Ligand binder design. Structure first.
Ligand SMILES: CCCOP(=O)(O)OC[C@H]1O[C@@H](n2cnc3c(N)ncnc32)[C@H](O)[C@@H]1O
Length: 622
């Protein structure tokens, strides 16, 4: 009984109403077909992933070799001779079948201020922005920084970069000017797409003013594409800044999509790591797109006429994979939500679902716990078409699971706790919608092409059998796996492939129970997740140490109901001219200037245990 977190927890089947209220049948017949297809995906993956790639993707030129490389050397290449384009698979091929089919369902910050975009309209707007970038010097292989909020213009900026072969480096709207500047210089981006101002939950985000303050140290940026979101008077540097609505009307509504290799870099997504500077994880085209289409088809049970809603932001891989690519690849409607879960009221999430007849909802448990405390007077909507409920970022608690199952799902929808990371590109351990039975707090079985292993951290040896515990690792590579860390492959190898040779190291502790289910126990390294943002404790410590009156700094993350994790900072202060309260206030703002407002610590305590600072003694006292 080594796995104590699985003691007495029971299996939860798919509700009988799921099958009764289903428009069609699910993609897999039963649980055995999963096992049959899963064992095929790990025994002979070369034949498996080849059949899947041609069913879900349409290539310019066919491929011959499914996979070469290994995890030992970090030289993985998938579908090496194939050629394709991301914009074609997301827009063009669906617009060819029927251009009047809905692609994007835009729900603006204020209710009843959105719009509905068809695949034909999406192809035109993507083609126009593609032309604007081409006429601004964007060539194949260049990087473009996307500093946009959750407006439909963000999805257009994604595929416009992919249509011409550019590499889009999306920066979460709300990072400080210093964070944006660093992500621009590291990727060498010469073009940046942004808005004049942002509108989230009634508050205004001065995006354009942040970009201006960031570009003061980014000289190589020569083009800024600004979209008029609020129309407020914003600083304008002429010759460099250009208005979206002005430049868009100059160029044709169609452009030919650049043929890309399977292993051409598709995008960069900068992810905070265990140490040093935030590193830009890279994903190629064919493998990543196949990962998104596969998980959408089998985890979320996405069909043609479905309406998909993911609460994640585009600044995160959740919005990358499941707001943009996975739904559009499969040809359904994706909901682009610009507001907060509690604006103007706590029923907003469900207001959108009922209005747009959403079939699949994807939320973080941190947002569920906040709405659960508010009261059940807000969730009185029928939400008749809600079929798959998804959680991400943390294991869903048994009490939160029941609320998600009864109030939202009406005891008729399948809850899927999906475990994955930015470097996985898509779900790796998750239940299959309408197939896999679940356990509250467990991520259920692994996905196709995911061979998980429990590793003894001290011994570095794999622990076989069930009812085992250790750290989580993958034995063989999968198509969606990240290919490198931009500008630092050595850092990529040491972080993910040199910890346990022949394995991919997730950086999480895990356990496997008697039934074979997996239980994610959280990060092993110095990494925390606050409000959906992945932060490094070492990075926050460096910002605090920069203060002239901070001798040393120590930051540790503990559990928190409001934001998943809470960053608590221990600081040592020399004598100074201003009091501790002023320094305490000045220490929080200093972190906001380096990283952002969300990186602000919950509390700072002027105090230092050492032998090497013991993080455990600092956490346990809290
Ligand atoms: C994909 C969400 C955002 O991705 P990021 O790369 O920012 O963070 C991934 C990490 O979030 C946790 N995590 C994510 N999903 C779960 C999950 N379902 N259960 C437990 N922990 C989870 C795991 O520690 C993981 O290494």
């Amino acid at each position: 009984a080594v796995v104590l977190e699985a003691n007495d927890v029971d299996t939860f089947h798919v509700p009988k109403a799921f099958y009764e209220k289903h428009p069609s049948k699910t993609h897999l017949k039963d649980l055995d077909e999963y096992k049959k297809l899963y064992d095929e995906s790990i025994r002979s993956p070369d034949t498996f992933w080849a059949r899947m790639a041609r069913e879900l993707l349409t290539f310019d030129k066919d491929f011959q070799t499914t996979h070469i490389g290994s995890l030992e050397n970090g030289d993985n290449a998938w579908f090496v001779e194939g050629r394709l384009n991301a914009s074609f698979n997301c827009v063009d091929r669906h617009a060819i079948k029927n251009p009047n089919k809905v692609a994007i369902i835009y729900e603006a910050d204020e209710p009843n201020e959105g719009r509905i975009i068809t695949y034909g309209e999406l192809l035109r707007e993507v083609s126009r922005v593609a032309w604007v970038l081409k006429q601004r010097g964007v060539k194949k292989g260049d990087t473009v920084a996307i500093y946009l909020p959750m407006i439909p213009e963000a999805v257009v900026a994604f595929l416009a970069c992919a249509r011409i072969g550019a590499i889009h480096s999306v920066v979460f709207a709300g990072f400080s000017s210093d964070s944006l500047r660093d992500r621009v210089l590291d990727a060498g981006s010469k073009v940046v797409i942004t808005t004049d101002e942002g509108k989230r939950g009634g508050k205004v985000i001065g995006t354009k003013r942040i970009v201006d303050e960031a570009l003061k140290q980014c000289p190589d940026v020569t083009s800024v594409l600004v979209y008029k979101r609020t129309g407020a008077e914003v600083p304008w540097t002429n010759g460099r800044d250009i208005w979206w609505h002005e430049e868009v009307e100059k160029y044709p509504c169609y452009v030919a999509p650049e043929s890309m290799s399977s292993e051409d870099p598709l995008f960069l997504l900068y992810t905070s790591g265990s140490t040093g500077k935030p590193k830009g994880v890279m994903h190629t085209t064919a493998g990543y797109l196949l990962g998104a289409a596969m998980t959408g088809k089998y985890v979320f049970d996405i069909h043609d006429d479905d309406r998909f809603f993911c609460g994640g932001d585009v600044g995160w891989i959740t919005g990358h994979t499941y707001v943009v690519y996975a739904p559009l690849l499969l040809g359904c409607s994706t909901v682009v939500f610009e507001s907060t879960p509690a604006y103007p009221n706590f029923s907003r999430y469900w207001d959108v679902i009922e209005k747009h007849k959403v079939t699949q909802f994807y939320v973080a448990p941190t947002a569920l716990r906040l709405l659960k405390r508010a009261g059940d007077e807000h969730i009185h909507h029928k939400m008749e078409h809600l079929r798959i409920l998804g959680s991400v970022g943390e294991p869903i608690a048994a009490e939160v699971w029941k609320w998600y199952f009864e109030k939202v799902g009406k005891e008729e929808a399948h809850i899927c706790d999906t475990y994955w990371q930015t470097e996985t590109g898509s779900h790796v351990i998750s239940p299959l919608g309408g197939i896999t039975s679940t356990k509250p707090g467990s991520a259920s079985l692994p996905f196709f092409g995911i061979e998980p292993a429990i590793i003894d951290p001290v011994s570095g040896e794999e622990i076989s059998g069930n009812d085992v515990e250790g750290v989580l690792a993958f034995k063989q590579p999968w198509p969606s796996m990240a290919r490198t860390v931009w500008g630092a492959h050595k850092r990529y190898m040491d972080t993910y492939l040199n910890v346990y040779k022949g394995y991919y190291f997730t950086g999480d502790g895990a356990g496997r129970d008697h039934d074979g289910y997996y239980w994610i126990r959280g990060r092993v390294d110095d990494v925390v997740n606050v409000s959906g943002h992945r932060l490094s404790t070492a990075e926050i410590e460096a910002a605090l140490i920069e203060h002239h009156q901070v001798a040393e700094a120590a930051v540790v993350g503990i559990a928190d109901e409001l934001t998943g994790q809470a960053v608590n900072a221990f600081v040592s202060l020399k004598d100074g001219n201003e009091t501790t309260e002023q320094v305490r206030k000045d220490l929080v703002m200093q972190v906001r200037k380096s990283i952002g407002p969300f990186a602000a610590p919950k509390a700072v305590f002027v105090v230092l245990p050492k032998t090497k600072i013991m993080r455990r003694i600092l956490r346990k006292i809290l």
